[PDB]
Amino acid sequence: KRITTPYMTKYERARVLGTRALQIAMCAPVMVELEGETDPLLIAMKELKARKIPIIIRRYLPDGSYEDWGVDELIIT
Amino acid sequence: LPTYAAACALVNSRYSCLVAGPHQRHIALSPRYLNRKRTGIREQLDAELLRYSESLLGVPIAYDNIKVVGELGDIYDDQGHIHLNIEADFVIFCPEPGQKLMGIVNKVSSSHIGCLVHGCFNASIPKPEQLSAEQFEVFRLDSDAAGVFCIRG
Amino acid sequence: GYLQRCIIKHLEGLVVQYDLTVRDSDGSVVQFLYGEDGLDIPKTQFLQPKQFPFLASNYEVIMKSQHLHEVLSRADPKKALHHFRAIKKWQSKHPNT
Amino acid sequence: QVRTTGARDRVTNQPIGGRNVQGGIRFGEMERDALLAHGTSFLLHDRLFNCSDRSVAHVCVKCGSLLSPLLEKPPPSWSAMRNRKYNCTLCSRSDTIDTVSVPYVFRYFVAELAAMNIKVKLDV
Amino acid sequence: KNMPWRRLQGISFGMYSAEELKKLSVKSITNPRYLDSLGNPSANGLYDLALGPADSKEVCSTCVQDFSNCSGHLGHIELPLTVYNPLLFDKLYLLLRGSCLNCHMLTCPRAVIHLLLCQLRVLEVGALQAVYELERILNRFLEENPDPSASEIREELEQYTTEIVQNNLLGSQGAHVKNVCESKSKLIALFWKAHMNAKRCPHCKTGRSVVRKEHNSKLTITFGYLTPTSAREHLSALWKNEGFFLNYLFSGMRFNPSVFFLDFLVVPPSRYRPVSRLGDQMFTNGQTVNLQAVMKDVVLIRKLLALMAQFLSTLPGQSLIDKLYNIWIRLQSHVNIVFDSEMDKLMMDKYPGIRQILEKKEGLFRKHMMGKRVDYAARSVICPDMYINTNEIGIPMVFATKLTYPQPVTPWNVQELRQAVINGPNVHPGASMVINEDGSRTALSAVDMTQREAVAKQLLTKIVCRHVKNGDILLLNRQPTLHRPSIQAHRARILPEEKVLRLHYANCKAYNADFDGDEMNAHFPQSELGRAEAYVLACTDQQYLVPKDGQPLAGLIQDHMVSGASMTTRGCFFTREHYMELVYRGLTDKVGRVKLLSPSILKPFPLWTGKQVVSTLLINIIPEDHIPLNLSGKAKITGKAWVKETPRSVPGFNPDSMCESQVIIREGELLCGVLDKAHYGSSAYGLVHCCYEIYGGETSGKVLTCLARLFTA
Amino acid sequence: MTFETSFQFLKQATMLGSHDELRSPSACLVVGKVVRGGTGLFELKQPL
Amino acid sequence: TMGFPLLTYQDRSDNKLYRLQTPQSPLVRPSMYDYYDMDNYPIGTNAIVAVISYTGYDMEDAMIVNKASWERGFAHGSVYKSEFIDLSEKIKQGDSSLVFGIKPGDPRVLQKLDDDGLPFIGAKLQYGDPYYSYLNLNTGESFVMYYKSKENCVVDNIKVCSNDTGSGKFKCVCITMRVPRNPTIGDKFASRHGQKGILSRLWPAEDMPFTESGMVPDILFNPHGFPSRMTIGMLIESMAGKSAALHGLCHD
DNA sequence: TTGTCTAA
DNA sequence: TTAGACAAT
Ligand SMILES: [Zn+2]
Ligand SMILES: [Zn+2]
Ligand SMILES: [Zn+2]
């Protein structure tokens, strides 16, 4: 039972692509085929269009509770 | 060399002071082992043995059954060096000051006697016991820096 | 200067929570929806009635942008169009509030 | 005006500034304001904590003072069989002096409230 | 290596029980000599090595670490007598003017001090529904049977304040709300003010003792100098009798009156007290000379006690008497000079104390804690430029061989960092400052290539502080910043042999710039998440509107509102080579085929039109899969502006049907109308605003950029 | 204390023993934290 | 305006004297410019200004100067940083016996400072050069002070000042340094009708719109400084300077 | 220069 | 009910 926005917001996409781009750097393994760029932000943003980023988000409701949404299932704009 | 040898060939008989049980750790893991976490955790623990800390009080010598704790790993604010926690049936060693261990001699002279405990502990044993000029017990035990433990006595 | 600084430091915490209620930096509920309807100020520019002919054309250009609304889930208007027909029935029988 | 790995001052070791050469660039109160209004918490974290006076601090999780831990001297055993541990004097215990990440200006705030006989509990 | 992960949850700052500091301390100091004549820090002094070390070439005396990683060691200046606590002095005088001499109770009636004692332990739980219930039931009780015989508690007030603590037992955590701390500040301020009137003692019918505060340093009892050594014996016996209420006023730590009275002053660590030179008084620090004055007066009082063991104190006011209250008020004012300088208005030889370090706008909370001077930032002059994009900035070469960004080595970026190490830190195709696996760095130079290539063979087999390139983000800042688009994140571009920063014309309506030597701060986000929220959230293209009303504020300013009214007028006619030059001037490195149009006049000559050049540009800058936009509307030039003759009214023709007022773009192609400020300026509901609310940000940045490059060329 | 008159509010935050749980943007930069803003309103996990 | 201040640069010791190499008298000037004979000290150079929105960098109070015309000498300048150096008002430790001098065997002053401790005349100075050296006469230990300014400069002349009696010891000096200070990007010009324009971009001469007479312009000025500021006087000055240079006249 | 807080 | 006191631009 999870009732929040099904849409990924902008800040969600910023932190997911930031950490995922740092989850590419320091020899970290990549899960899509690449045309050969060296900027990790392009790599992490191509996995967002791939829906291959496995990250689960703990959206803190103000009680202290949270829902576990998945970037695989969140609808980008 | 830290030798496994079928869970140390069960040297937890009498006269050896070591206790083996489950624990709880805090492993700070690199993002290069996102996939293939098993060799990452066990390689970091191989790069963790033979020194002292608090959750593994005295010193370890082996470990088995590394099982991860929980479903979700923790990614912090800016770091990205992901933090997992481990419960595992450790084989660790309590040094127990006031006990008697074994010795394998390799470098011995009139100034000092070098003997080894478990083939890993470079224990420097002083040769004179103030008896005469013509010629073990434990009182102080402290580790060295680079991945080894030392015994004075 | 000073006036803007004080209005800043008495309004630094009013972030919008996931349940869309404007709460302070401790849980204190100010508003139940932001701005009494829930919207945003940048994204309300093409909602005015004079910019509805612009959205009457360009319909396929925005269908391409996001197409949750026709053949995808979470787009059931039953519980809300029921509610609006209830309200318009109440104004049909009780005109003067 | 270009700044990288510049000289910090001895109190509050952030870059110096001060109407001369080798001085850093102030971020500012209204920039704090506007950058919170953007919603980018981490660029503010970068430009306000990660790039100026980031320090590691040691607290006992039991009590919670930045003053109470005290590190021993190395033994005279000549860099062999040496400990290099911490000792919380208020607890007299060799456990749970954990590390945290707080600004060095905040450590001057804590060791300067101690001049005013105030101590802060940190929930760690 | 071994960085801290353990975060925080909440802080709470209270006071010192004076036993704790003598265990936290290191040394009793008692020596008025800072440094020796050579520069050696003096033994047992205020800058002793047993405190936090002051130099970088002598280790401290307690620890055997350097100045770099020392925590900070504090000592104590012990006092011969007791002084007041200046933090609690203005709440000490408010207790003693309500207390009594022989009986150690107070003059407040018992109904009030029961009502507050019951209301405070309700607001610890954070009930706040019972703070009217308690006054309702105690007014009902006092109406039923008024008596002082309820000495400890009333039965129903105490019964309800036990039931309200038992219900919601874990309510220590639900009391961070504004409304709870509102009533808790209001009621305690009402008890400090309204029910603390100095009056006679009500229960034992005994004459009271009234104290008076004068010049914020002396307490005069009325039968007059009350010594703090006797205020110890007053306050202790007062608190052992009224602790069950004065521990609910004062939460604190068990809260004893060792915090109202100071028996020793504690010094901060000497690393936090820096050295100072070249002033009116040299070689002095303020919080060191205040404690110097204190320690000199402590030497004076030990001289006085040496005299009273069975001149030497001609310097105090009354040298003839043997007792000297005046030296004791001298020491207590020196303690006030340490903690503050607003409470002393007398002594001319003082420096500002720890209140003045913290409170005002040039302090810490508004000068060093909320806004900090930052590394990896640049400040330069801005000038116009237009051959950069709107989401772009030109970073002079000098900045680009001096601003360097960190990058770890993946297998993907071995070769480019290898080339950057090959370059060396002056030459910019990208250059380097590489730091090894530990904290040791290389900081490679450009004097020799052999060391650089020897490092460059060992990159993958170590991160590199590589220089800024033509895709990196700099965060741009022009003070004063009054609104949200006043700090945006522009993509860098490295332009050779420059001195000034360079911006497009759409952005200096947001930054409120005027291109007249307005100097601009360019922060460079060093981390990697700080890149990502700058590409996504703080991007220039994404913030096209204003937070005030949502009107646009990115547009084209001066030459372009003339070229658009000249070019998209009906009269222009281009031939084939002029058209194919203008279309490619509007574009630059469009990745695909340029999708050209047909001539508007096919015979006698292939004449294009000025409107088809803008249309060709739109169809080429709208993305590949997205179909172009429709639009209609109205422009800034009216229909009365194109008139030259006197208009004749033809019978069946409305002239606005065929007029140049109406911009009637169809399928992304202009078919009527003149483009003005009303369609690609800062004016709302135009072409570059519709392209923002259909296609997004980067396309609506490309429309402004490409229509600038077209209308200049 | 950061807003105005820090000495009086440290007096009224030490006499009363006030504790704050660090959910404010003005407090989350006094200590080194990330505010409850846009990109600090949630934390972030990896499954397995 | 950086103009020609004065004729005697050698015996005046101001802090900054902004000099303009080759100023010109204006062709279109009022009668009060000659009633007071201001041609003793002229302040600006004439310029062939063309009012065109040609480049793209020519907007919002900025302008375009021809690059080759900048290279040939257009509004070149100098600024004379003079610095009165006294060895008792600044350097005071003991006995005040400080004269300028070099101690023989000091490699810090080899070929950079002269044998008296003062630098040479004509010697260029950069950031990090020895600036002067002074010899404590009682011990023999000479010190050195370094040139801690950012700019590059040339020592124009050095004057050795005594005291008001005539018996002062060799301890006061006043070094005067030329600093070139040519037009760079960001140097604000103006006409005589109060219309400032910052220098935005030096545009090369082959790119300049040449006229029908063979002339490139000299400074490109925007048409978009005119409708809000209403300087009709600049247009009549433009027509009048053109009609005065075409005839040899000087116009009232 | 306000505007509330404190003391007579 | 009204004068000193305290902080900010
Ligand atoms: Zn502790
Ligand atoms: Zn130390
Ligand atoms: Zn009494």
Side-chain angles (χ1 to χ4, degrees), chain C residues 4-5 9 12 24 26 28 41-46 48 51 54-55 57-58 60-62 64-65, chain E residues 176-178 366 370 482 545 547-551 625-630 685 689-690 693-695:
Chain C
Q4 185 176 359
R5 179 174 176 83
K9 294 198 74 63
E12 272 179 343
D24 291 336
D26 54 1
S28 302
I41 294 99
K43 295 187 288 290
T44 183
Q45 295 290 316
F46 277 93
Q48 310 299 322
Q51 275 66 235
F54 176 77
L55 278 305
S57 297
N58 297 310
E60 296 172 350
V61 193
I62 311 164
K64 290 181 96 291
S65 67
Chain E
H176 305 292
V177 180
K178 182 192 286 184
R366 296 180 65 186
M370 197 171 179
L482 308 178
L545 302 178
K548 184 194 288 182
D549 204 1
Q551 300 289 111
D625 295 329
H626 297 172
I627 61 172
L629 76 156
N630 295 105
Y685 294 154
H689 178 67
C690 291
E693 295 276 330
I694 297 299
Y695 300 111

Side-chain angles (χ1 to χ4, degrees), chain C residues 39-89:
Chain C
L39 290 180
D40 198 2
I41 294 99
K43 295 187 288 290
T44 183
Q45 295 290 316
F46 277 93
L47 296 175
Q48 310 299 322
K50 300 302 292 294
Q51 275 66 235
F52 284 163
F54 176 77
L55 278 305
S57 297
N58 297 310
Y59 168 59
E60 296 172 350
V61 193
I62 311 164
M63 282 177 70
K64 290 181 96 291
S65 67
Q66 191 59 254
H67 193 73
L68 189 281
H69 59 95
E70 291 293 329
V71 296
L72 274 299
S73 68
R74 274 74 57 90
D76 48 351
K78 278 80 175 175
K79 296 292 182 287
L81 184 60
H82 182 196
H83 189 78
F84 276 109
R85 283 181 291 177
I87 298 172
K88 297 297 183 287
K89 189 185 288 185

Side-chain angles (χ1 to χ4, degrees), chain E residues 342 355 359 361 366:
Chain E
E342 193 270 331
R355 179 174 183 178
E359 179 180 358
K361 73 277 193 184
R366 296 180 65 186

Side-chain angles (χ1 to χ4, degrees), chain B residues 52 54 76-78 124 140-145 150-152, chain D residues 42 45-46 50 79-85 94-96 101:
Chain B
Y52 72 98
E54 180 60 32
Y76 281 96
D77 47 0
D78 202 6
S124 67
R140 179 66 63 191
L141 51 94
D142 281 324
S143 178
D144 200 0
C150 183
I151 297 170
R152 182 69 182 272
Chain D
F42 286 107
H45 182 274
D46 293 330
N50 195 4
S79 69
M81 295 180 71
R82 61 108 180 90
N83 292 317
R84 194 253 182 274
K85 84 282 190 185
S94 176
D95 197 5
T96 191
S101 65

Side-chain angles (χ1 to χ4, degrees), chain D residues 59-65 68-69 88-91 93:
Chain D
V59 289
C60 181
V61 181
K62 183 178 179 180
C63 289
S65 178
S68 64
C88 178
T89 60
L90 182 63
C91 294
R93 190 177 61 243

Side-chain angles (χ1 to χ4, degrees), chain E residues 60 63 70 73:
Chain E
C60 60
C63 302
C70 179
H73 304 286

Side-chain angles (χ1 to χ4, degrees), chain G residues 205-225:
Chain G
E206 63 267 14
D207 296 334
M208 295 292 290
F210 66 98
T211 63
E212 200 268 335
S213 296
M215 289 164 60
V216 302
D218 200 355
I219 287 168
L220 294 181
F221 179 69
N222 202 2
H224 294 277

Side-chain angles (χ1 to χ4, degrees), chain E residues 227-492:
Chain E
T227 63
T229 57
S230 180
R232 295 290 299 273
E233 295 289 329
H234 287 86
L235 264 297
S236 178
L238 176 59
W239 272 81
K240 297 296 186 293
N241 203 359
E242 205 68 27
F244 62 95
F245 183 77
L246 295 174
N247 288 323
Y248 294 166
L249 289 180
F250 298 156
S251 181
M253 294 178 284
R254 192 260 184 275
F255 186 82
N256 53 2
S258 297
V259 301
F260 285 96
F261 295 97
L262 297 180
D263 48 353
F264 64 98
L265 289 181
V266 51
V267 297
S270 295
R271 64 176 294 163
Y272 296 103
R273 295 195 304 270
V275 295
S276 176
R277 289 182 67 249
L278 293 177
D280 54 356
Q281 181 61 258
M282 72 288 197
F283 194 69
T284 57
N285 193 359
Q287 287 80 20
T288 311
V289 298
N290 294 322
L291 296 171
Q292 182 187 7
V294 171
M295 185 176 287
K296 175 68 74 175
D297 202 0
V298 168
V299 172
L300 185 63
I301 301 171
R302 296 294 173 92
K303 183 65 68 178
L304 181 62
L305 270 295
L307 295 179
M308 290 186 287
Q310 71 270 17
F311 294 163
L312 276 303
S313 293
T314 305
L315 300 176
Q318 58 275 18
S319 180
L320 54 88
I321 204 163
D322 204 6
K323 59 191 291 181
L324 287 165
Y325 292 161
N326 211 165
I327 309 173
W328 299 347
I329 190 172
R330 189 186 301 275
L331 186 67
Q332 198 270 330
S333 290
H334 281 291
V335 173
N336 288 116
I337 289 167
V338 172
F339 287 177
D340 196 355
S341 296
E342 193 270 331
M343 290 186 282
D344 191 7
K345 271 77 72 177
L346 274 300
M347 284 71 169
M348 75 289 195
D349 50 357
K350 68 170 75 69
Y351 283 172
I354 302 104
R355 179 174 183 178
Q356 290 82 22
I357 303 300
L358 302 179
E359 179 180 358
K360 74 270 288 177
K361 73 277 193 184
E362 50 187 0
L364 259 73
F365 292 100
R366 296 180 65 186
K367 187 176 184 291
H368 291 177
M369 297 179 76
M370 197 171 179
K372 301 182 185 179
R373 297 186 189 272
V374 70
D375 277 330
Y376 289 94
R379 184 178 181 182
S380 179
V381 185
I382 60 169
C383 291
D385 193 356
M386 192 268 299
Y387 299 142
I388 62 172
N389 303 320
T390 55
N391 55 3
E392 197 89 30
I393 193 166
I395 302 301
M397 167 113 7
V398 251
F399 295 156
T401 253
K402 313 263 317 202
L403 235 46
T404 104
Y405 166 85
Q407 179 70 44
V409 178
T410 66
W412 294 101
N413 54 4
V414 179
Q415 188 177 2
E416 287 83 4
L417 289 174
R418 188 178 291 172
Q419 292 177 356
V421 173
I422 284 167
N423 288 319
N426 289 319
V427 187
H428 183 275
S432 293
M433 181 181 288
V434 63
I435 179 165
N436 293 117
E437 298 292 329
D438 58 352
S440 69
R441 69 264 187 96
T442 302
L444 68 157
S445 180
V447 66
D448 48 356
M449 184 58 210
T450 299
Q451 295 180 357
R452 289 180 289 174
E453 60 88 22
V455 172
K457 294 293 185 290
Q458 290 180 355
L459 259 289
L460 181 60
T461 301
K462 296 181 177 68
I463 76 169
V464 176
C465 289
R466 58 100 180 270
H467 284 95
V468 61
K469 296 191 290 186
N470 293 318
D472 288 332
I473 296 292
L474 275 81
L475 191 67
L476 270 302
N477 201 172
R478 177 178 175 268
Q479 288 85 14
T481 55
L482 308 178
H483 53 98
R484 179 174 68 88
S486 290
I487 173 168
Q488 302 178 359
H490 296 288
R491 300 185 72 189

